[PDB]
Ligand binder design. Sequence first.
Ligand SMILES: OC[C@H]1O[C@@H]2O[C@H]3[C@H](O)[C@@H](O)[C@@H](O[C@H]4[C@H](O)[C@@H](O)[C@@H](O[C@H]5[C@H](O)[C@@H](O)[C@@H](O[C@H]6[C@H](O)[C@@H](O)[C@@H](O[C@H]7[C@H](O)[C@@H](O)[C@@H](O[C@H]1[C@H](O)[C@H]2O)O[C@@H]7CO)O[C@@H]6CO)O[C@@H]5CO)O[C@@H]4CO)O[C@@H]3CO
Ligand SMILES: [Ca+2]
Length: 712
Amino acid sequence: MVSIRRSFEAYVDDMNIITVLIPAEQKEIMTPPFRLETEITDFPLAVREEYSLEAKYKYVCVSDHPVTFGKIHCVRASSGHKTDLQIGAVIRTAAFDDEFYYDGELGAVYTADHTVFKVWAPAATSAAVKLSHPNKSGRTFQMTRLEKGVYAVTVTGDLHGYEYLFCICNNSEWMETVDQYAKAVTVNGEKGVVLRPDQMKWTAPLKPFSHPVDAVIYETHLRDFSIHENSGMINKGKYLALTETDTQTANGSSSGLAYVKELGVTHVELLPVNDFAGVDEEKPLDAYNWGYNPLHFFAPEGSYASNPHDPQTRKTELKQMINTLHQHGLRVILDVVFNHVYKRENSPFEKTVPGYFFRHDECGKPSNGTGVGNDIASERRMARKFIADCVVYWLEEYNVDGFRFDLLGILDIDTVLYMKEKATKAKPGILLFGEGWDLATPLPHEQKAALANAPRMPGIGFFNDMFRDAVKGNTFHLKATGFALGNGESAQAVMHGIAGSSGWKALAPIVPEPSQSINYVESHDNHTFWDKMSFALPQENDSRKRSRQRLAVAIILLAQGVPFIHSGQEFFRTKQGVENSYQSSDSINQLDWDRRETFKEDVHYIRRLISLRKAHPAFRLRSAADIQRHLECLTLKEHLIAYRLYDLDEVDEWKDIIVIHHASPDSVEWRLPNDIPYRLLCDPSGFQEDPTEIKKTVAVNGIGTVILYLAS
Ligand SMILES: OC[C@H]1O[C@@H]2O[C@H]3[C@H](O)[C@@H](O)[C@@H](O[C@H]4[C@H](O)[C@@H](O)[C@@H](O[C@H]5[C@H](O)[C@@H](O)[C@@H](O[C@H]6[C@H](O)[C@@H](O)[C@@H](O[C@H]7[C@H](O)[C@@H](O)[C@@H](O[C@H]1[C@H](O)[C@H]2O)O[C@@H]7CO)O[C@@H]6CO)O[C@@H]5CO)O[C@@H]4CO)O[C@@H]3CO
Ligand SMILES: [Ca+2]
């Protein structure tokens, strides 16, 4: 780790304060008065304070005129020595932000005639764009500094297909980096690429989605979803797999697009499709990764494309996949990672404006609330601009229908509300939700976009961890059990979740409205419900485990709120006991289409539960007030919960609906709240083809759900 030889050090830690560090053994030589020099500049520096450090003597100096960025500055000691004025913590100040905030567009602005290149590098002193092209002439042009610390250069000619990089000079060190706003990149994202608009046409217009509680989210990874040999899809592990119609397994069961459509899901949530690190796009089968290692936020991941070498190909295919899903009435949700980047030190952010895009602790070191190395400082104005810019771009360029914010809690509320405004204006009805876990990131608690602040973020949903653990059992204790696994201690919390988690008697609200409660019992994180239950219930047979998992599904799917289903959950997806499969092999992560065949009947139960929810608005009340007015608990025991939806005049096709969840293998009788004859729609055996009529009482045999309804 070599470096530029310097007499001593000097940094701009604030708009008008320069910190001078002098090596210990030079303390009596390199001494005050110090002066700031530049072009015509040469002013005095007042010493506000001075004190010794481990191996240096420090001076906190003050300048009369605020430092002017973009020009190389020199600080001179009385001894005559000099050093270049480097960048300090000044970059993270509100004053710096307000002085250089730029509201225009950044990146490569293409025209067949010419391309304008723009990059925000306020603390830099020089910048250039580096152009290269497969077997063609490479050229590097100096860029000019305009207002708001923006560097630009216009290159005449058609730059389509041209690769580009930015060279940014900070603290006299030039760094090469990919444009933060790169909309196309080379294999493995080594360089950005300029491409003319692909003229993609969206031919499947969708009306704005009605309301969150009307959705059914299906979480899937593009590789997992079709990589299995028996998947029935040609483009295994690629964007195009989901475009294949009427595919089926070897035995003839539905698979792929046809399958997802058949299940009745409304939104397909995809794990990260922006370019990420972790899979060598040159040898994709050699490694696996969920994709939570952000490299380029504005470009698609290359391992999911048929050809990662051709810049345009991945864009074409992701857009086709999305358009096709839309043709078949399916919407798309993008998992986005604006809480951190892969390898902060070599990131486009850090190489362009050192120390600006990442939060630091009170000691000046990069914070690590995300737990993976760095926290993007969303509150910095150009960061907020970036996240908002990115969200609107994926909506406009890729026509998606919503976003799942990975570690939403790391983002600040103002940024979230700022992007929400722009996002909903660009696409009414889109879903916006995420994991608002409270994390140790340097932000006042009321500013975190966490669950605890849900009241200030209307229109934003949160994964309901309370409802999740209430049903399944604590996810951080293998043996911990939930209601569905037989623990009566969580029955009340479960009832609360069934009511939308917007307040239940002595229980404080989890979220203000049900549209903000993302209800689920499984996701890509942690053990699958099946493996979790398997650890907590070591002595239970497969048949009973299956009834319990189907039971958890009924609870979630018949609960007020927004149902969320992990891909494969419908058929007891197992990961061989692996808790965190972020980099595990395909044998571990693949969607097992063989298992989907084996348990096609169970899958069918989930399908009927979804159809039930869709056919009856009683399960989809839009407000905590309506719920308070149509939902009531009739029984709450350790293994038995019964609730009913009433006064469904012009709400539901049915007059009254009773749902009973039983979490024990024994048999029991349950008295209805009246003597009117009801229809037995479902029981532990599953939905009944021709609903028989029962009266006053009903048998609840074993683990499962019994549904009764009264037509009007
Ligand atoms: O950080 C190490 C941690 O990493 C992995 O867990 C991830 C997880 O995959 C993410 O989903 C997310 O989790 C969220 C939860 O979803 C959310 O509910 C909440 O979690 C709270 C729990 O609900 C609550 O019960 C309690 O958890 C206790 C827990 O019962 C204790 O057992 C103990 O947990 C320790 C784990 O046993 C240990 O493995 C490790 O955790 C790993 C985890 O295994 C891995 O899958 O360390 C923890 C130490 O805390 O203590 C906790 C807390 O007292 O409280 C939590 C806190 O809200 O929030 C989390 C995120 O904070 O993120 C985790 C973290 O990476
Ligand atoms: Ca990649």
